[PDB]
């Protein structure tokens, strides 16, 4: 996961962020552990869970003003 995508102008330090778009994730991340078939369905699927923090954050900006912290 130095990533095959070539960094603009070649250098000895890979620009690993700017190279990667969806690599290592799922594919080379679960190293040396017993592989389950169906566990992801209940283990991993936390999209619903992260959607709550994004709403909450968009609510609180108006509310800090209404408290006059802002």
């Amino acid at each position: 996961p130095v990533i095959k995508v070539r960094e603009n102008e070649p250098f000895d330090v890979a620009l690993r962020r700017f190279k990667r778009s969806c690599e290592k994730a799922g594919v080379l991340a679960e190293v040396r552990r017993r592989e389950f078939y169906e566990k992801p369905t209940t283990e991993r699927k936390r999209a619903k869970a992260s959607a709550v923090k994004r709403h909450a954050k968009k609510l609180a900006r108006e509310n800090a003003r209404r408290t006059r912290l802002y």
Binding site: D12, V13, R33
Partner: protein, 64 residues
């Protein structure tokens, strides 16, 4: 390590280098900087890290 190997191969008579990379392990950049310090150009830092189509079950490791 990179420097150990790069010295000896001058007798095989090599002058320019490319690299294939295969792993999640440490030494990501610092092994490349040393290949560059043997006087070689290293324009191609090519990942070929093989992803099987979900291969053989790995060692369980800890009992949790």
């Amino acid at each position: 390590a990179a420097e150990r190997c790069a010295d000896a191969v001058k007798e095989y008579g090599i002058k320019n280098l490319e690299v294939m990379v295969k792993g999640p392990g440490p030494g990501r950049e610092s092994t490349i900087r040393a290949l560059n310090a043997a006087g070689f150009r290293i324009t191609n830092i090519t990942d070929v890290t093989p992803i099987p189509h979900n291969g053989c079950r790995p060692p369980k490791k800890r009992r949790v």
